Amino acid sequence: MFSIIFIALLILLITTIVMFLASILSKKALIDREKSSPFECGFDPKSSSRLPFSLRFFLITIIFLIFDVEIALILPMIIIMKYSNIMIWTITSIIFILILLIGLYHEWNQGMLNWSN
Amino acid sequence: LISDGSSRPYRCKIKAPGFAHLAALEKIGKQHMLADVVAIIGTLDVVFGEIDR
Amino acid sequence: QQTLPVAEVAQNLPKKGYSPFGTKQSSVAEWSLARLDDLLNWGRKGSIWPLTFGLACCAVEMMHIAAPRYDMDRYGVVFRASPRQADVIIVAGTLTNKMAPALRKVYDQMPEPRWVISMGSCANGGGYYHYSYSVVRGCDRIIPVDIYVPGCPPTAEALMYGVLQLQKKVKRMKTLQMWYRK
Amino acid sequence: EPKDIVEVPKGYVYVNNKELSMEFADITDRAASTMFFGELLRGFAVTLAHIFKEPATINYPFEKGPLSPRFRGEHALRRYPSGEERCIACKLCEAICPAQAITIEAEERADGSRRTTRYDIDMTKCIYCGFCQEACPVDAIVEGPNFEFSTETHEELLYNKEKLLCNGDKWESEIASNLQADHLYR
Amino acid sequence: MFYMEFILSLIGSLLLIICVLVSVAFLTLLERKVLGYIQIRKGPNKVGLMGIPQPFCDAIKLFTKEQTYPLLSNYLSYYISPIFSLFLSLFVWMCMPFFVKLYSFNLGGLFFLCCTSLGVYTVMVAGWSSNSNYALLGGLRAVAQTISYEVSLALILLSFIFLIGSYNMIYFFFYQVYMWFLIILFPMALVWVSISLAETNRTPFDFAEGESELVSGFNVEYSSGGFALIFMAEYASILFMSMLFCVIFLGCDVFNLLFYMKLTFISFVFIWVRGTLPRFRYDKLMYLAWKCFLSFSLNYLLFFIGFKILLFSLL
Amino acid sequence: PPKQDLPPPGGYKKIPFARVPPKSYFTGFTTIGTYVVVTAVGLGIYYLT
Numbered sequence: 001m002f003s004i005i006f007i008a009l010l011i012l013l014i015t016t017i018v019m020f021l022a023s024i025l026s027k028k029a030l031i032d033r034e035k036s037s038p039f040e041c042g043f044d045p046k047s048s049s050r051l052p053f054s055l056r057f058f059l060i061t062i063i064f065l066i067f068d069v070e071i072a073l074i075l076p077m078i079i080i081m082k083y084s085n086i087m088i089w090t091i092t093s094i095i096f097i098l099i100l101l102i103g104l105y106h107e108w109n110q111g112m113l114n115w116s117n
Numbered sequence: 118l119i120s121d122g123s124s125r126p127y128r129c130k131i132k133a134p135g136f137a138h139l140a141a142l143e144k145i146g147k148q149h150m151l152a153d154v155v156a157i158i159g160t161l162d163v164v165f166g167e168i169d170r
Numbered sequence: 171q172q173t174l175p176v177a178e179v180a181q182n183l184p185k186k187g188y189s190p191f192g193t194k195q196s197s198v199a200e201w202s203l204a205r206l207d208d209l210l211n212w213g214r215k216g217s218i219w220p221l222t223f224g225l226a227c228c229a230v231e232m233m234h235i236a237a238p239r240y241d242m243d244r245y246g247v248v249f250r251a252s253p254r255q256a257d258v259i260i261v262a263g264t265l266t267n268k269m270a271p272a273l274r275k276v277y278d279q280m281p282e283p284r285w286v287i288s289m290g291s292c293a294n295g296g297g298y299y300h301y302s303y304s305v306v307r308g309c310d311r312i313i314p315v316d317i318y319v320p321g322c323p324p325t326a327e328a329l330m331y332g333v334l335q336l337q338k339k340v341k342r343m344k345t346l347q348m349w350y351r352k
Numbered sequence: 353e354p355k356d357i358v359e360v361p362k363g364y365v366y367v368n369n370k371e372l373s374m375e376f377a378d379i380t381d382r383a384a385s386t387m388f389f390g391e392l393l394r395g396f397a398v399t400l401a402h403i404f405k406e407p408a409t410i411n412y413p414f415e416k417g418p419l420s421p422r423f424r425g426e427h428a429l430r431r432y433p434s435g436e437e438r439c440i441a442c443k444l445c446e447a448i449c450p451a452q453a454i455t456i457e458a459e460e461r462a463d464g465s466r467r468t469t470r471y472d473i474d475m476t477k478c479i480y481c482g483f484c485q486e487a488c489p490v491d492a493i494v495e496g497p498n499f500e501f502s503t504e505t506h507e508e509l510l511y512n513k514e515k516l517l518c519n520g521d522k523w524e525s526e527i528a529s530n531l532q533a534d535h536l537y538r
Numbered sequence: 539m540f541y542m543e544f545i546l547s548l549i550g551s552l553l554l555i556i557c558v559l560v561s562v563a564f565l566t567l568l569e570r571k572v573l574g575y576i577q578i579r580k581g582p583n584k585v586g587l588m589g590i591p592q593p594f595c596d597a598i599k600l601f602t603k604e605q606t607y608p609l610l611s612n613y614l615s616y617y618i619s620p621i622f623s624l625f626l627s628l629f630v631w632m633c634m635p636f637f638v639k640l641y642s643f644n645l646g647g648l649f650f651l652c653c654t655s656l657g658v659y660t661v662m663v664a665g666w667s668s669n670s671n672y673a674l675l676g677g678l679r680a681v682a683q684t685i686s687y688e689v690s691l692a693l694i695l696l697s698f699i700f701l702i703g704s705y706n707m708i709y710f711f712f713y714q715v716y717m718w719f720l721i722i723l724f725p726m727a728l729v730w731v732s733i734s735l736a737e738t739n740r741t742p743f744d745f746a747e748g749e750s751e752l753v754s755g756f757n758v759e760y761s762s763g764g765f766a767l768i769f770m771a772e773y774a775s776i777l778f779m780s781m782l783f784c785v786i787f788l789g790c791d792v793f794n795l796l797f798y799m800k801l802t803f804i805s806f807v808f809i810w811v812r813g814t815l816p817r818f819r820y821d822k823l824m825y826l827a828w829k830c831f832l833s834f835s836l837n838y839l840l841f842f843i844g845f846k847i848l849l850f851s852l853l
Numbered sequence: 854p855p856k857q858d859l860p861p862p863g864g865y866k867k868i869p870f871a872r873v874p875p876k877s878y879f880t881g882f883t884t885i886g887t888y889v890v891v892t893a894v895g896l897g898i899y900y901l902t
């Protein structure tokens with residue numbers, strides 16, 4: 001691994017050096033009150049502009065986590081399949097996926113993504 | 118077009134279809150997604166100049 | 171007014187060189203700084219990125235140039251939407267009072283070296299609406315214009331000819347070579 | 353073809369009356385289209401094909417054109433075949449100029465001839481409409497064919513009579529050609 | 539001997555880094571040319587000899603262009619994200635397969651999942667540093683796109699993983715030694731193109747940077763040098779996926795030029811999409827991610843798991 | 854000869870204004886059945902691999 005670690009450190013150092021170098025290569029200009037404003041198509045930005053956090057994107061990412069963990073559970077099936085007892089490996093894995101489908105199809109009839117808002 | 122009898126037009130009001138077509142957007146665009154709004158502006162085909170002049 | 175040389179005069183004359191500075195530099199520093207300017211100008215000249223402001227009527231020609239008849243990316247020109255990544259601004263159409271502060275803001279949000287082409291008569295001097303209560307008479311009164319492309323609108327050939335003229339201006343700009351004197 | 357859904361009289365064409373069949377061959381066709389993106393494949397192959405069409409880019413400025421004899425471009429004040437100024441200061445060109453981009457002041461030259469002193473055009477106000485030349489009674493001023501007249505400074509665009517005369521001298525041959533082409537036709 | 543081993547491992551990593559960077563920077567031209575001919579344009583043929591040095595020209599412009607840093611104190615945080623993104627897009631290469639040992643990198647598929655995952659943090663913090671609602675919407679839309687597709691991406695992998703019988707990528711070569719693997723898993727290839735295209739944020743799934751809906755998405759508030767790094771990072775990404783498509787479906791023949799012919803064709807195919815498809819909506823894509831792909835992947839998982847059970851039965 | 858823009862002798866051939874689809878290479882039955890055939894042969898080859 002540490003061969004990988006050192007290479008990444010080397011790259012990152014070379015990366016920052018390049019961007020550090022470009023920071024000196026690019027000519028400077030006297031700062032301007034307006035040059036450093038948020039871009040709002042050329043009309044003054046409104047109040048703070050911090051978006052509302054009343055929304056669903058956490059909800060989708062929570063679906064991600066559930067399936068992301070479930071993915072973790074099924075990752076090792078590749079290797080153990082040669083070793084594990086076949087009934088248990090067969091049925092056990094099959095019901096994983098089956099429950100996933102039924103969760104999905106039950107959830108389509110729920111249709112939770114088609115929120116009213 | 119209103120002519121007062123001279124060689125110079127007296128009043129020339131111009132009704133461009135894009136005018137009314139765009140006013141309805143405030144109602145047409147209700148609740149659709151942002152991407153839908155942009156596509157709605159396109160299908161309105163409200164070319165400019167004719168709207169404000 | 172001057173005029174082109176005649177056939178025999180051309181025969182006597184040598185190659186016109188490539189770097190517009192020439193190759194008469196005296197010392198090593200002069201000669202070196204001449205080349206670095208040439209490289210810089212070559213970079214800024216070959217790749218130039220309009221902002222596509224394009225308010226009106228003129229904008230249609232601003233699109234025809236992107237069209238495949240007088241191809242402009244052929245020359246290394248691309249329409250970046252974001253002004254932070256756009257290097258040039260082709261102000262085209264009329265500048266009404268509601269727009270004046272917007273154009274100003276867009277201009278200076280763009281980082282330099284920034285060049286402006288005033289396309290069309292409406293931008294050049296207010297064009298056909300010059301004596302109007304709502305129009306900025308010209309766009310010289312809001313921003314520093316660099317190249318004027320007369321026309322109403324300019325034929326696409328005229329526009330991209332002006333682009334090449336901007337490339338020539340970008341080619342002859344003296345920044346390192348003459349910093350050395352500064 | 354499937355039947356319609358609204359019966360149409362003439363003078364019209366409904367663009368959606370065609371029914372989406374429920375025949376099994378018809379549904380399986382659509383299903384197979386979605387399962388293997390046949391329509392995308394058709395469009396995909398189109399663009400591959402259309403690489404093999406030669407691009408229509410003019411190698412400007414070497415290759416260039418085309419225009420037509422009536423093209424409205426750089427302005428020019430012509431001169432008679434003797435070399436005398438054609439303009440007589442009749443001032444119609446100014447009177448018609450929609451943008452009011454023309455300014456004229458005329459007097460008598462010492463010979464007693466009616467001629468201009470100042471004759472100014474602002475090609476930051478001109479719209480290249482050509483009303484001036486359509487009005488001039490002696491073809492004094494014309495929309496010459498040049499269109500690459502691009503300047504780095506705004507002041508350089510306001511032409512006066514000296515600049516306009518120079519363009520006329522410079523472009524006289526081409527302008528003569530066009531007028532010979534269009535005078536009897538205009 | 540041993541230190542011979544280490545020295546070469548570092549030379550190869552370094553050598554690959556310069557090549558992949560110069561390739562993608564130089565590849566940008568091939569996008570500009572190729573797209574130029576999809577459209578009836580002629581594409582860049584002006585600078586140098588036939589626009590060959592066009593991308594070097596571009597870099598010179600950018601690095602000369604100043605760095606219009608946003609609001610006063612953001613200097614670092616705005617200067618971090620481009621580094622932390624180009625780093626991922628490069629370093630993801632080191633897991634790529636060789637017969638000529640670069641690494642003994644096992645769990646390569648896992649590492650693929652991990653690097654492809656880390657793109658979310660780069661884009662999100664980049665938008666956050668920018669502090670402009672335009673940039674912020676782009677980041678959120680960008681985040682949602684990537685995060686949603688990873689779910690399908692994982693299960694899609696597993697189908698191949700089972701079909702090869704390990705997580706070591708190299709076994710793709712041994713199992714493809716007779717007949718290519720696309721011709722077995724044709725539908726997966728179309729889905730995998732879409733997944734890969736979604737990851738690199740190209741169109742039809744162009745919401746993250748996009749245009750005409752967000753000015754440039756998260757990219758909108760980026761000056762030159764940062765922008766060049768982001769732009770290079772994306773193209774290092776588009777190449778790598780093209781490589782991964784090649785090593786999975788199309789032979790994995792690392793020591794055969796035809797493999798590199800296949801690299802170009804696939805990367806071309808990405809462009810071939812760029813100039814053809816229109817863009818999706820937000821919601822329609824999420825349907826396509828969960829309601830279409832996840833179902834698809836699970837079926838093949840349940841299909842191939844049985845197949846390999848039957849295969850194991852036979853032998 | 855002509856002195857003014859007029860249509861030539863015989864008028865002009867009618868301009869085509871009719872849509873025309875391309876060759877419809879496959880149908881739902883053919884497409885799916887061919888897909889399964891390919892997959893089945895693919896399974897066999899993978900077995901031997």
Ligand code: SF4
Pocket residue numbers: 226227228262263264289290291292293297298321322323324
């Ligand atoms: S200058 Fe002419 S073409 Fe341009 S916006 Fe004005 S009227 Fe239109």
Ligand code: SF4
Pocket residue numbers: 438439440441442443444445446456487488489490491492493
């Ligand atoms: S219309 Fe012709 S002749 Fe009369 S003033 Fe104008 S240019 Fe001179």
Ligand code: SF4
Pocket residue numbers: 445448449450451452453454473477478479480481482483484485
């Ligand atoms: S072309 Fe039209 S606007 Fe221009 S000077 Fe002639 S009459 Fe005036």
